[PDB]
Every structure is written in structure tokens, then in C-alpha cells.
Amino acid sequence: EVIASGRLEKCVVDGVTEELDCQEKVVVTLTVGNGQSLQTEALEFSLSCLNSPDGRCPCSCSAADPTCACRDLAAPLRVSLTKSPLWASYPLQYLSSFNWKPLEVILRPSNKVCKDGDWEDSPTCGWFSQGGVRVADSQGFCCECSSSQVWDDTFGSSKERTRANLDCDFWSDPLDILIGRKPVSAHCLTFDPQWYSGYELGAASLQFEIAITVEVPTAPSPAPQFLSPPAPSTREVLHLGPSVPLASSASRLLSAKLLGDLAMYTQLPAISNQVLMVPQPPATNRSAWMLLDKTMLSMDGLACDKVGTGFSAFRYQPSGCGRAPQACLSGQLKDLWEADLARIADGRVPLYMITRFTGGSDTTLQSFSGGPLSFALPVTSHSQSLVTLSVAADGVRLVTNRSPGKITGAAVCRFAGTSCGGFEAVAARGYIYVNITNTGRLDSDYTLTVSNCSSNVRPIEARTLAVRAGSAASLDPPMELYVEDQAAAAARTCTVSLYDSVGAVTDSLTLSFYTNATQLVVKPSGGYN
Amino acid sequence: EVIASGRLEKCVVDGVTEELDCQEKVVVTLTVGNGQSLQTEALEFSLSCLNSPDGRCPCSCSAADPTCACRDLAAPLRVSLTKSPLWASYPLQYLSSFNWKPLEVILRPSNKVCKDGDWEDSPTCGWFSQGGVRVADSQGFCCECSSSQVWDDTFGSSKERTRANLDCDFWSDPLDILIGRKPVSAHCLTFDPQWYSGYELGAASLQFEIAITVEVPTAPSPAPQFLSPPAPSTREVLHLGPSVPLASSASRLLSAKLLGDLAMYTQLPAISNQVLMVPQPPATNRSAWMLLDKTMLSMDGLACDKVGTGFSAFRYQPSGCGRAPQACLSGQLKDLWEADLARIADGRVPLYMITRFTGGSDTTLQSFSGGPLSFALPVTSHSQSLVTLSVAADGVRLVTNRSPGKITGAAVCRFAGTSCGGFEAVAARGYIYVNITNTGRLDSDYTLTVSNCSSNVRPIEARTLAVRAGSAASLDPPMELYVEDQAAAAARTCTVSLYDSVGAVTDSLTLSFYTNATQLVVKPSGGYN
Amino acid sequence: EVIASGRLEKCVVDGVTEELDCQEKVVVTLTVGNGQSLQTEALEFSLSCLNSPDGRCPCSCSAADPTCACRDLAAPLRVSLTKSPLWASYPLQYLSSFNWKPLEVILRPSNKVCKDGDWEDSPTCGWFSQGGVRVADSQGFCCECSSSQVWDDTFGSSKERTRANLDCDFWSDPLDILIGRKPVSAHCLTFDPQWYSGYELGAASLQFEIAITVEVPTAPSPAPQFLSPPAPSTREVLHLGPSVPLASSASRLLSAKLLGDLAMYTQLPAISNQVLMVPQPPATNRSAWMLLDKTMLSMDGLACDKVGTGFSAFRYQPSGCGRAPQACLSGQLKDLWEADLARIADGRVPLYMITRFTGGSDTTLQSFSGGPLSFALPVTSHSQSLVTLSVAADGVRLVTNRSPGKITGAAVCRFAGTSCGGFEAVAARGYIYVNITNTGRLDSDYTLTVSNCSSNVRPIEARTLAVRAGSAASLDPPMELYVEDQAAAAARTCTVSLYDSVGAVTDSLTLSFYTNATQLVVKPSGGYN
Ligand SMILES: *[C@@H]1O[C@H](CO[C@@H]2O[C@@H](C)[C@@H](O)[C@@H](O)[C@@H]2O)[C@@H](O[C@@H]2O[C@H](CO)[C@@H](O[C@H]3O[C@H](CO)[C@@H](O)[C@H](O)[C@@H]3O)[C@H](O)[C@H]2NC(C)=O)[C@H](O)[C@H]1NC(C)=O
Ligand SMILES: *[C@@H]1O[C@H](CO[C@@H]2O[C@@H](C)[C@@H](O)[C@@H](O)[C@@H]2O)[C@@H](O[C@@H]2O[C@H](CO)[C@@H](O[C@H]3O[C@H](CO)[C@@H](O)[C@H](O)[C@@H]3O)[C@H](O)[C@H]2NC(C)=O)[C@H](O)[C@H]1NC(C)=O
Ligand SMILES: *[C@@H]1O[C@H](CO[C@@H]2O[C@@H](C)[C@@H](O)[C@@H](O)[C@@H]2O)[C@@H](O[C@@H]2O[C@H](CO)[C@@H](O[C@H]3O[C@H](CO)[C@@H](O)[C@H](O)[C@@H]3O)[C@H](O)[C@H]2NC(C)=O)[C@H](O)[C@H]1NC(C)=O
Ligand SMILES: *[C@@H]1O[C@H](CO)[C@@H](O[C@@H]2O[C@H](CO)[C@@H](O)[C@H](O)[C@H]2NC(C)=O)[C@H](O)[C@H]1NC(C)=O
Ligand SMILES: *[C@@H]1O[C@H](CO)[C@@H](O[C@@H]2O[C@H](CO)[C@@H](O)[C@H](O)[C@H]2NC(C)=O)[C@H](O)[C@H]1NC(C)=O
Ligand SMILES: *[C@@H]1O[C@H](CO)[C@@H](O[C@@H]2O[C@H](CO)[C@@H](O)[C@H](O)[C@H]2NC(C)=O)[C@H](O)[C@H]1NC(C)=O
Ligand SMILES: *[C@@H]1O[C@H](CO)[C@@H](O)[C@H](O)[C@H]1NC(C)=O
Ligand SMILES: *[C@@H]1O[C@H](CO)[C@@H](O)[C@H](O)[C@H]1NC(C)=O
Ligand SMILES: *[C@@H]1O[C@H](CO)[C@@H](O)[C@H](O)[C@H]1NC(C)=O
Ligand SMILES: *[C@@H]1O[C@H](CO)[C@@H](O)[C@H](O)[C@H]1NC(C)=O
Ligand SMILES: *[C@@H]1O[C@H](CO)[C@@H](O)[C@H](O)[C@H]1NC(C)=O
Ligand SMILES: *[C@@H]1O[C@H](CO)[C@@H](O)[C@H](O)[C@H]1NC(C)=O
């Protein structure tokens, strides 16, 4: 869209010669939208003379002169603008390394010998080391049959749990028990061969590039009106972005400036301060990657049932010998990954996997240019770039292509396309997949809107689509759909509208979806009454 | 405010017929402010002919023809714009269910029998179940008199604490103690009848609707100058918003586009990733609702003194029998709610209640259109919407109403209006309540500014107010006021200015407030010296 | 940059007299950039008459009249705009007080007497109090030689750790051990004399002030063209900002409006909800200040190895007597500060110190106007302010100064300038320090860009610099530089470009830097195999 278009006398005072150079320019301010991938509209700046060196018309030299390229002839300077896919890239800062799944190994020594002392040189589990220095509390812990447990197991069965499932019965091995050598167990902390590096994510940065194609005419162009045959011209592509928000033509006929983007209506996911878990090595494979909130972790390794739970946490756990094997070792990377695989299967969105933003596919993040240790997300909310073009021309006009369209498909699917037709209310979300077609002979821009929805359907923001002539396109990633009630519904409705480049509806369709009632965490029953 | 206003030749190349249709349009870009609730200003687009089908003037048909509605007559196309209240709505995703207040029930069996075994079929507290399966560690724990405690209580008094306050004295019941049946206690975990559903909040989305009222003239209008009598016209309201950022007139004389909003000077509260606690059922009542940081919770129920503390945390607590009743069960939803009620009474802002954003009132969130399971907040920071109007007219002019105003009241009050006159420095904030009056005969826009403040008073952002003719208005929600020093002050000052629609001060007033010194957490005294 | 420039008929309907006052104005919308500190460009509004009271030309009174100041003469109204340094200020809300370093004092009483009872009136460590009330669990804990430990230490050496390093050997003191008086120890929790106040940070607010200098002419001004000698004029400075986004001239020839800023390409650090640790007292000294994530803290004091770990956490720690002295007391403010000093020395960025945002210097935050209890950060991402000027003039022109420049230095340094030449890949970041010079006779604006970088170098956003004539300037704070691979590289490259005010490169330079391989946390080796 064109914000402003008009004439301005722009003067420049030279820094070294103090001389003032004034020239009237056509100043255009326009927006370069998020999904503006095709050259579907152009700005035609009218020039009163061609091949002007200084940009000033009329010609100061004679056409009879072979060294005078300037011709007092009219032709338009055609300027089109596109934007590359927009990404929110988060800088990584390495914190620590985390094991996939620390595992407890239980030893039941035949000789009934168990050594877990802090000053023990030869313990049952052995010691761990770090650069030749012995790691504190890495020797594990020992457990033995309680005198009460031996009594209960001999004359019946002990109701108290033993971590290693020891048989405390006197008759299980009476010779050793009699002389004090009661059944014993060793509890060693071992690590999975797979380790993960943890990187804290910084603040998002919008990353894109705007390409301005400038067709500079060298000669003029050779009841229903049609577009004039193109003038012999010289193409030139200029690039703008947050890194380089400035650019000028070689002729310096055109000068562009990236002012900045307007604010996004839907904020970016709050993932700064989270810890990105990347697999340690034995194109970038972000499939196994996870992004975890700091509450899910134990940085110092001193806390149980957390990502990073270490030797001290495991060794000194309250009533450790009376707990079940692998207690203290829940909520590890392997557990969380598996809990998420379970969630996807239940039509729910993962909490830890990095695909919880894309909507299922790992393939969408792959198209990102960043290095092996980079993380970014596709931006779907509109982020309108204000660009200001300053041209040495008489005037300007806007020439927009308007091809009609048709919605060829629309469905509400679950995460990772588990099933289409609807999703679980409030405990899950749906994904609006839409297939559209350009039914014209020209590349054109379109707007997909979801509105006039049934009760308690969260508003969905619109989507921009640049579709090639006669070609088919789809929304990637799809639109997120949430309901604001926990009830089961057979046919919740929404109108899916397809607007052309001029703001007229070319196609409309009613999208129907079901919701399954929210499956709340089931309350425990019983206890003291 | 009007950013740009000028003429642009806009051409459209038809997608199927390839024919070019050019027409010069008046292009206006303007801002639609946050508190723009009334039609206080209009854009008058001058038309050289009325009832034109194609929007093109002059008339291509004869006035003598009954099927020709077009008249070569002048009249303005009046266009006014308003914005509905702006909301930041956060999508809910169900995580788990949390009890209001888990309660410990202490049993002191007469028969001195206590069973807390892991494999015990009939324990003292009984078992809890989930879908017929027995819940692990839900049988509670048992405590008994230490042999040392029986000795101390017999020959004096035990200085060691017992959880159930057992009388370990031999003479309390000598017959049972003699035969080994020492006093015993059972500690059962029970749950309050009230449960709460926990929903993780997603990213904010700005939600509003812009209404453009278009008065299309059908006939012309029938030293101090006055406004011309209105021309016989046909009203039409068009709507723009993040969902539908496009709109055109039925006549397609006017075409609107929502470009997006500028960034807000004061960021939205960082409440994404927090867990919204909604009461489980036995208009939407968000009064009892709470919003909690993940650090306040124990999702897996394995950690003590957290929202979600469960059976394992309670059963295996270090020196559990030597702690006070209800240990491990602090910091529950009931405790936090009560700690917040306490805070409000002390002139402090709640940390967990969802009213900690509004400034006291539960009534402000009630005016939100969302479903029973929706959460949103009123936006008070300016969020300026850029709208671009493209009209088939000769020119345009802006007609703004300028009614004078007066500040009829201004006070600094505490949270939930506890008391007015001031607040506690740094540990609390104040709320600037302002009452203004339109002292003119026309609906008008105003700006309330708080500036020229005394030392260490945090800058307050301005506020837009559209007030009806002769009517009274107030700031809702009020302005937040913070000080940057911890000292007690009798009369800290600020200038409250009321600007008219033209940028001239109609009323000014000096607002005075006190601050009570920051009441810091009192340090413990004593211990080893 | 100038967005729009054109004429608009602006009408005002008086609220009390209902009379319409129309006047055609020149409406200019422009951007006021982040580093726009100097008056390097001006807008010249052409006036057809001078000293007009109503702003309307031509003169309604005779020049022959002594009480008629109006002269039908031409002169420009010169308007320049600057912006003060931009800050993101976070409101403080006091939560609690935290000790610098709680310390454990170990007592080994000669008389072998240790009292740690909950109902004990005279315990070994003594009690702590709060307003005369005894603080629960503040009496510490007692430890004694295990009967097994006495046996092992007598007939060899005990392999089990004792917290106070007790000699459990019978022969160490046989008289007392024989009669049951085994070696005992007391473990008292003491506090460092230094305490810190913890303040929760609220949401960021952009804070700046735009100064518009208006030179109102009173009389007219007295082949290579030069700038006309200045017209006798009267200077006037107007101020805009989030608090007061409105302003008008005394002549009301000029009327300004702050529309708002465009969104920043690089989001502000996610520091809301974090706890700012300010030293308690015995210009503002923010050197010792720290900003901590809530996961680093124990608000209720019930959890070990956290900022806020208190008496209960310390008293009831699992196997407390078998742990090393000061266990439970790790991760305190003193520890974190020291771990950060260690990080800076290793070329790494601190995690807790508030200098982790500036890039090393404490001096950058000092230039902030806020009170003793205020926190703010310098904004380096562009934040473009849209300003709309509405002037009673015939037309306008833009006069920009263009002085050439040169890059006099460029280096990649570590945090706090540890060493220049490069940094540690992914585990650290580099800081691009750039020194530029204005080689002209006029104050001018410039753009520093970092682009055409070697593989896996994170894109750096551009930087605006207003440099005085003939003067030297540098980027403060410096540019952050991250790599997207963990490899060691000798010469990673980037082009540092210096653009003049017109968008032409005046100087270019290639910046070379090394990266040291990411030093990952070393995995423990050993344990059970
Ligand atoms: C989520 O809900 C879907 C639909 O919602 C509910 O539909 C009814 C079952 C009814 O209870 C209504 O009030 C709800 O709104 C569930 O999908 C339905 O699944 C049915 C069983 O699989 C299916 O049925 C018939 O299926 C075929 C014909 O299609 C027959 O061969 C068969 O014998 C059944 O009669 C029904 O058509 C289907 N409905 C839709 C709209 O797809 C869905 O299973 C549920 N999800 C989960 C995981 O529970
Ligand atoms: C917060 O501070 C308020 C005012 O600040 C302080 O005012 C003085 C007490 C003095 O110490 C000064 O240096 C401070 O700035 C407190 O309000 C004050 O409360 C007083 C006692 O209630 C009150 O007094 C008189 O009140 C009436 C007359 O108004 C008499 O009948 C009575 O006998 C007292 O003489 C005083 O007027 C009032 N001041 C104001 C400005 O309202 C406020 O209590 C305090 N809040 C808390 C919770 O401590
Ligand atoms: C981070 O890396 C810097 C450079 O990277 C590496 O340089 C080589 C050592 C080589 O391994 C290459 O593949 C890497 O890219 C380290 O800086 C280097 O440090 C060397 C030893 O201090 C130094 O060498 C010579 O230094 C002087 C001459 O300058 C001689 O007197 C001396 O005898 C050595 O021969 C080398 O020049 C220097 N390189 C650069 C580019 O500065 C840096 O130490 C390292 N940082 C850490 C903390 O490990
Ligand atoms: C959008 O169009 C694609 C086809 O271009 C649809 O995908 C096909 O779906 C059928 C039936 O499930 C499969 O047999 C094909 O293998 C699919 N092709 C591809 C390339 O995936 C898709 O379902 C359409 N989406 C909507 C919402 O209508
Ligand atoms: C703004 O005006 C309202 C009245 O319209 C004031 O509220 C009244 O205050 C008096 C005195 O406390 C009460 O008796 C009334 O019941 C209140 N009315 C309502 C509707 O609340 C209010 O105090 C004024 N605010 C300021 C800051 O001056
Ligand atoms: C930018 O210029 C300053 C000088 O104005 C440089 O700083 C000096 O560096 C030398 C050598 O290290 C020291 O002897 C001086 O004491 C420094 N002066 C000051 C004021 O710090 C600085 O190194 C230059 N930076 C770059 C990147 O070239
Ligand atoms: C990514 O990594 C996993 C690791 O198990 C592997 O199975 C997969 O094939 C890899 N490649 C892709 C493209 O997913
Ligand atoms: C209202 O919604 C229904 C579908 O629910 C649709 O048929 C209709 O066209 C919509 N009307 C408007 C005015 O949006
Ligand atoms: C909201 O819920 C509470 C629950 O106790 C009830 O007391 C109250 O009356 C309800 N209604 C309103 C409007 O607050
Ligand atoms: C300065 O502040 C005082 C009130 O503290 C006010 O009376 C005065 O009008 C203000 N002046 C300006 C120029 O803002
Ligand atoms: C700030 O505080 C520290 C406290 O130890 C002190 O050493 C320092 O000199 C103070 N001043 C400055 C300007 O750093
Ligand atoms: C490409 O980068 C190199 C430095 O790496 C530089 O010399 C060259 O000028 C750059 N070219 C462009 C077109 O940016």
C-alpha cells in the first residue's frame, strides 16, 4: 500500500565546499508486507528525459554529440518491491551439558559387601572424575535389610518397600544373616551415551531482506486500454534490511530508505531465557532439539527429578532406600521427549519439542539461512515495513495486478496432522490449512481472512499471500485456532474469505469443525474420610 | 491525526482481460488512536458529481433520463473514524488441576496401631485411586514416640517437637508403653472440596475494531463562518481490525486499509508462560482467578510448599515427624490468595490475583467479549493504528471539533481504593484518578498529561479521552504512579494538564501526594555471636 | 527522513461558538531517529508575510501603523529536530531482603553438650528473633559420633564424612566417650553484615524527549549556489515525548504531534519478572547491583542452595551431619557475583551482574536521569519516532548537511575489554568497537553497517551516528557479535561500512576476528561399567 506520494525540494549542503545543491524529488512512502514474495505491483515514475547523468531534465548536452547519451524523451522508471521470508532469530549462549537419561544401576553383591563412604578409596559403584579430580558424592549409596524388615519377611511378608527388592527373609540365606551379613544393595548413577548441550536463548531479532527492482529506461516504449509495451530498460536490484537500511541506484535516480516495521498484532512466543537443548555430535537437523523453561532444570545438579539432576541429589535423597528404583531420576530429557510424543498422539501440542511453534513440521525451520547453532521461527503475524523512495522524476503512478481467486480447500487439523475435522477444546488447538488458486493470467496478491465465527472462537489474524499466475498456493505454516469454552461441539463455524489485491472478495467458504470436551486431569478419590 | 493527504493515479491490470483501468484518487493516511470512541472529527472529500456508478465524474449520462441517477453537482463525502476498546487477549492451554488447600489430617489411634507400608493393603489413612489404580505414596506416613522422647517426657519434658503433639510420658498410659505399644500418629493428606484448573497463557494479541462511518451524498446541501447544513446522504459503516484489515464502500468510492499499529511506549505485562488458575465449576466471574509464575508450582507434585504439592512430597519429607503439622503444605492457592488480601489491606499490590493489572476493580475485565475461558487486559498505552483511505474525489479537508475542558477532580489512591492521598514508596504504587468535563456544545477529543513532577517521580505516559458534549468523563483504568526513592514525603507534586483537540491547554492543576517510607523486611536478630 | 509533505485545509469547529475556522496548512510527517543528537538537517517553511498574529497572510493591517508588526515579506521558518538518548526504564516493586552470604558457624563444645530442641529455651546456637517473637527453626542443628563411627575410628579410620570433622576415635578422649559423652557439634546459621533489597522489575517503558527548534523570522535575509545568510529570527524550543506527545509554537505558526515509534528490529532483553538486588545502605552506584531470575531464589527460605535459603532449609537438610560444612549454603549472592567475576576473566558474559547488558562498563547506565531506585538500559536498536508538523506556510523544503567521513578504527573485543582480536564461539560474544571522524566543516548524520560477513556470523543491525564538524565519535555501547558455529577460526571477516547522510558510502573497511572453540562442560568419567 502507498502511504504518501508527492513532491519535495530536497537540498544538500556539501560538507567540504559548503555549496547548496537543490533538486525537486518525488517522495513515496509505502509498506512492504510480510508475504510480499512476488513483483505483483509497480510504481511508474515519469521521466522527462532519458540517460541523464545528473538526474536533471531537460538535457544540458546536444543529441548530435556522440558523447551525449541524454535524450529529451519520456519513459517510466518502473519500481517493484518484494520481501524475503521473515524470521525471528534468537542468539544462543552456551550454559552447560545435560544427559539424555541418567540411569540407576542396582547391584546386589553376593559377598554382602557394600562401601559408600565419602573417604572410601574403593567403593562398590566406583568414583567419577573430572580432569583427574574425584567428583564429590559420585560413589552412589548403599542399602541394607532393616532388623524389623528381616523379622517381618521371616514370619510373614514386609509391607515396607526396599529400593533393590531385597528378600529379607532369614531362610533366603540363613548362614550369612545369622553372622550379621544381611542382604545389601548398591545404587550407582550411570549416564546414557547421548548428551545434550544447553544454550540460553537471547532476545528475538527480525531478519528479512527487501528487494527493490529498478527498471531504468534507456529509450521510449515502441474503448478498452492496455499496458504499454515495455521500454528498453536496464534492470537493477537494490537490497534493504535491518543490517543495511539504506540503498541508492547506480544512476542515483532512486534512493531508498527502510524506516522500520510497524508493531505485530500477535506478539512473538515468550521463549527468551529458555534453554535450547541441542544433541552433542558423535544441513542442520533441528528435529531432536528441545526448548525448556528454567524451572524444568537443575543447573547445579543438587535437585531431584529435574534436567541436570546429579550425584548429590541422587546420593542424599530422603528415605532413598525406601523409594522405588529410578526415584529422583524422573523428568529427564528422554522422559519429556516421550511425554511430548504421547501428547502429539492425543491430539495435544508438545510442551518441550521446538516443533510446538511450527504446528507439526520440522521442514519449515529448515529453509532458514543461519549456521549449525542458530535458532529462528517463521513469523506469521503481519510486520509491515515502511520504505521511503526518493526519485528525480516529474510524477508517479501505481500499477497493481488484480487476478481473481478461488479457495480449493480448507480444513481444521490437529498438531502434526494427526487427524482433520477438529481438535480438543482448550487443552489443544486446531490448525486452519487453506489451499487457494490464482485464476488469472497475472501474478497477484490476496488476503485470507477467518471471521463471522460461532460462539467462543478466538479471533484469527488475516494472512497475506502472493500467488503466481494460474498457480496453487497454501498457508504455510497454517493458522492457529483456539476455542474459549470447554464443551464438545459437532459443528463450530467460521467464514474463510479470499480477498483480491483491490480489497474485493473473489471467493468465500464456510469452514466447519468439531471440538472434543476438555479432558481434565482426573482427581484422586479415597484417602481419609 | 492526518499523516499524508494527496493525489495518486492508481491503475489496475485485470487478471483475466489484461486491460488497464486508471483513475486518480485522493489518498489519506491517518492514525486512529486508542481512546477514539466518538466521531469528533471528519474528512470531507469533495465530489464533482453525485450518484456516480463508476465513481468517475463528470456524468456520462443525461439528467433527463429516468434511469440516470448521476447529477453533475457538488457535495462532500464525510468520513469519520472510531476505535473500540483495545484488549491484549492471551490464549489458554490446559496443563493440570490444583487443589485450593490440601489439608493434613492427624489421627492418634487409641489401639496404638499405625500402618504406612508401601505394600500395605489396609493402611491407617487408606489409599487414593485414579481410574481404579492405586495412587503411589497416597497412604500418608506414621510417627511414634522416640525412646529418648519417652525418657525425657517421663523424667521431665521433651524439648524435641512431635508432629501430632504426642504425650510421650510413661505415666500418660503406662500399661501400653510397658508392653512396647508407644503413642503413635497417622498423617493423612486430604483435599479441599474446591479445585482449580491451571491454563498456561500464550502470547498477547491486540484485539479491537475500527469503525469508519461513510456519509455518501445523494443531493447538495440546501464575518463569522458556520458549518453548512448536512447534504441528503446515505450512511454506511465499514469495519477494520487484525482479522479483516481490508474494507470498501458499496459504491467503491472509498476503500480503506488497516496498515498496522505503531509500537506501544510501555510494554504489555510479561504474563506469557504464567499459569492462570480458574475455579472448577460445581457472564464470566474472573474475581476468584489467579495468574501464577511457574516457580510457585510443583507440576509433578514431588516438591513441598508449592501449588501442586502431592503425595510423595508429603510422605517422604526430611524429619517429617519432627516438623509442625501442615509442614510441606504452605504456599497453596488458599495461602497465596490470603497473602494477597493481606497485601491489599496494607496498601500493597497483589502478586497472584489477576486484579493486580486493572488497579483494584474486577468490573473492568467484565466488558471483554471473549468466552468463559478467555483472559484479556485493557491496554492503556497508546497504540496508534495507521489507516489508509483511497477515495475517488477532487480533494479533501479535515473538520475537527474543538470543545474546551476542565479538570473537576484528581487524586492519588492506593490499590482497590483503600485510601486516597498517597501510597507506600517503592513497595507500592499509586493510582492517578482524574475527572474531566467537556464544557462545549460538541463531542471532542482531549489529552491528559502528568508532568513537571517533583524529584524521583517516574514519568507517566499521556492519556487520550473522547468526551461527549457537556458530559463528564474519568480515566478508566487509572494512571499508575511510582516513585524512585524510598523516603517518606509529605507533598510530592505533579502538573495534571488537559489539552484540547488542537493541542492547547484548556485546564491545568497541581496534584499533590504523600509517600510512606518503604517498610523493608525486618532482619532477624540474635543467633551465635 | 521525510515520509509525507503536502497541503491540507484544516478546519476547526469551536465548541462554544459553533463557528468554523478554516486554514490551509503544510503537513509534514517525518522520523526522528534514535541517535539524532545534532541539528544536522532543517525544514524551511516559506512564509509570504512576517510577524503575522493570526498566522494568515497577506497582512490585514498597514505597515504605516506603529501597532502593526506584520510585513508582506518573504523569509523561511527553519525547523530542526533532535532526540535525547533513548532508555528502557523498568519500575521497581520491593519484594524481600536477602543476605550477601549466610555462613555456617561450627561449634565443637568442650563439655560435649549440644541442645537443638524445638522447645529448648537455651540452645547451643541461640535463637533469632523478629520483633520480639522467636524465629522458628533458627536454633540450628546438632551432630554426634555414630556408634559405628566410634568403632571404625578406634580400630582404623571411619570412611563416613562428619560435618564438623569430628575425631570419633576412643583414644582421642577416652574418659568422656566411656561414660557416653561422645564428641558433639553445633551448626549455627549466621549472616554476612551486608544485606540486599530485592525488587521485582515491571514492564519496560521507552523514555526520551524530542526537541524541535523553531526559528521564526522577524525580517528577510540581508555557477555554484550557497546557503542564504540567516534571516533575523526568534528561536523557540518545543519538547515532545511519551508523557507530553503534543506541542505548539507561541505564534501557533507550528503545531507538532508525536504519533509514536515504529517497532524495534531487536527486542529488549526479557528482564521483566526478574529480581533486582540492590545493596542495603549502611549519584547512584549501580556497580554492585544484580538482576536475578526467580529460579535462583527461595522466597519463603524453605529451599536449600538458593538466594533466600533460610533457617528451616538449613536445619532439616537430608543427612545434614554427613554433608560437608556450608552445604545448603551454595548459590548465594556472594557466590553468583564471584562466579560472574570468574566468567568475565574467562572472556565470558556475566549471568547475574547488571553490566551483562551494557557490554562491560558501569559508566553507561550512570548518564540516566532516574532516582536512586530506578533501573534502565540504553536502547541500541533503532526506534524511529513519527512526528507530524502542521505549519501555516506556502510550502516547504528540506536542507540536509552532508559531511564526508572516515573509519579511524574498528576492533572485536571481549566483555569489559579483557582482550581485543576475537572471542569464544557460542559460549561468549564479541563487541564491535568503531571509531569514526566527520571530515567535513558541517555537523552531519552517518550510518555504520556490518555486512558481507564470513560463514555463520549472526546479522548485526545498523547504527545511526550524529557527529560534530571535524570531530571524532565512537559507538557507545558497542555492537554485539555472535557466531553460529562452535569451531575455532583464525580470521572471520565482516565489512564495516560508513554511509553519509545521503546514503553514499564515504568509508569502508574489513574487520577481522578470531574465535576460540566452544569450551563445553567436561563430562564425568568412571562410575559403574
Ligand atoms: C471428537 O469428536 C468427534 C465428533 O464429535 C462428536 O460426534 C459424535 C460422536 C457426537 O457425540 C457429537 O455430539 C460430537 O460432536 C468424533 O468424531 C466422530 O467419531 C465417530 C466414531 O468414530 C463417528 O461415528 C461414525 O463413524 C462412521 C461414519 O463416519 C461409522 O461407520 C461409525 O459406525 C460411526 O457411527 C463420527 O462420524 C465422527 N464425527 C465427525 C464429525 O467426524 C471424534 O472421534 C472425537 N475424537 C476423539 C479422539 O474422541
Ligand atoms: C502515610 O503518610 C501520611 C502522611 O505523611 C506523613 O504525615 C505526617 C504524619 C508526618 O509524619 C509527615 O512527615 C509525613 O509526610 C499519613 O497521613 C497522616 O496521618 C496522620 C494521622 O492519622 C494525620 O494526622 C492528623 O489527622 C487529623 C487531622 O487530619 C487529626 O485529627 C489527628 O489528630 C492528627 O493530628 C495526618 O493529617 C495525615 N496526613 C495526610 C497528608 O493525610 C498516613 O497515615 C501514612 N500511612 C500509613 C499507613 O502509615
Ligand atoms: C583464541 O585464539 C587466538 C587465535 O586463534 C588461534 O591462533 C593460533 C594459536 C592457531 O591455533 C589458530 O588455528 C587459531 O585460530 C589466540 O591467539 C593467539 O595466541 C598465540 C599464543 O599466545 C599467539 O602466538 C604467538 O604470539 C606471539 C606473536 O604474536 C609470539 O611471541 C608467540 O611465541 C606465539 O608464536 C598468536 O599470535 C595469537 N593469535 C592471534 C590472532 O591473536 C588466543 O590466545 C586464544 N584465546 C585463548 C584464551 O585461548
Ligand atoms: C491442499 O492440496 C493438497 C494437494 O496439492 C492436498 O494434499 C493431498 O491430499 C490427498 C488426500 O489426503 C493425498 O492423497 C495427497 O498425497 C496430498 N498431497 C500432498 C502434496 O500433500 C491437501 O490435503 C489440500 N489441503 C486442503 C486443506 O484442502
Ligand atoms: C470523580 O467523580 C465521582 C462522582 O461522579 C466521585 O465519586 C463520588 O465520591 C463521593 C465522595 O467520596 C461519593 O459520595 C460518591 O458516592 C462517589 N460517586 C461515585 C459514582 O463513585 C469521584 O470521587 C471523583 N474522583 C476524583 C478523583 O475527583
Ligand atoms: C578509539 O580511539 C581511542 C582514542 O581516542 C582509542 O583508545 C586509546 O587506545 C590507546 C591504545 O590502547 C590507549 O593508549 C589510550 O589510552 C586509549 N584512549 C582512550 C581515551 O581510551 C581506542 O582504542 C580506539 N578504538 C578503536 C576500536 O580503534
Ligand atoms: C535427524 O536426527 C535423527 C536422530 O535419531 C535421525 O533419526 C534423522 O534421520 C535425522 N535426519 C532428519 C532429516 O530427520
Ligand atoms: C456471517 O457468518 C456466516 C457464517 O457463519 C456467513 O454466512 C455470513 O456471510 C457472515 N456475514 C457477515 C456480514 O460477515
Ligand atoms: C463470583 O464468585 C464468588 C465466589 O465465592 C462469589 O462470592 C461472587 O458473588 C461471584 N460473583 C461476582 C459478580 O463477584
Ligand atoms: C513546572 O511544574 C510546576 C508544578 O510543579 C508548574 O506550576 C509549572 O507550570 C511547570 N512549568 C512548566 C514549564 O512545565
Ligand atoms: C560503588 O560501590 C563499591 C562498593 O564496594 C565501591 O567499591 C565503589 O568505589 C563505589 N563507587 C563507584 C563509583 O564504583
Ligand atoms: C563482500 O564482502 C567482502 C568482504 O568479506 C567485501 O570486500 C565486498 O566489498 C563485499 N561485497 C558486497 C557486494 O557487499
Residue numbers in the entry:
A (entry chain A), B (entry chain A), C (entry chain A): 23 to 244, 271 to 330, 345 to 591
Quote the study on this structure.
The cellular fusion protein HAP2, which is structurally homologous to viral class II fusion proteins, drives gamete fusion across several eukaryotic kingdoms. HAP2/GCS1 is the first bona fide gamete fusion protein identified. The presence of HAP2 in organisms across the main branches of eukaryotes (Cole et al., 2014, Ebchuqin et al., 2014, Kawai-Toyooka et al., 2014, Steele and Dana, 2009) suggests that it is likely an ancestral gamete fusogen already present at the origin of eukaryotic life. The reported HAP2 structure displayed the three characteristic β sheet-rich domains of viral class II fusion proteins, organized around the central domain I. In the post-fusion form, domain I is a 10-stranded β sandwich with the inner A0B0I0H0G0 β sheet packing against the outer J0C0D0E0F0 β sheet.
Here, we report the X-ray structure of the C. reinhardtii HAP2 ectodomain derived from a different crystal form that resolves most of the regions that were missing in the previous structure. The complex with the single-chain variable fragment (scFv) of one of these antibodies resulted in crystals in the hexagonal space group P6322 diffracting to 2.6 Å resolution. In total, the new model contains 551 out of 573 residues, with a break of about 15 residues in the fg loop in domain II—a loop projecting laterally, perpendicular to the trimer axis and roughly midway between top and bottom. The three “fusion helices” are arranged into a horseshoe shape, exposing the non-polar residues toward the target membrane. αF1 is 9 aa long and exposes residues W173 and F177; ηF is only one turn and exposes F192 and W193, and αF2 is 7 aa long and exposes P196, L197, L200, and I201. Mutagenesis altering the non-polar character of the exposed residues in the fusion helices disrupted the ability of the HAP2 ectodomain to insert into liposomes. The 37-residue long C0D0 loop is completely resolved in the new structure, and displays a CLL motif with three parallel disulfide bonds. Although the new crystals did not entirely resolve the E0F0 loop, they showed density for its N-terminal six amino acids (aa) (sequence PTAPSP, downstream of strand E0) as well as its C-terminal 14 residues (271-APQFLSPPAPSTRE-285) preceding β strand F0, accounting in total for 40% of the loop. The new structure resolves the N-terminal 12 residues of the stem, showing that it is directed toward the tip of domain II of the adjacent “left” subunit in the trimer. The HAP2 stem fills a surface groove in the adjacent protomer, formed between the bc loop and the aefg β sheet of domain II. The packing between HAP2 trimers in the new crystals involves 2-fold symmetric head-to-head interactions along the 3-fold crystallographic axis.
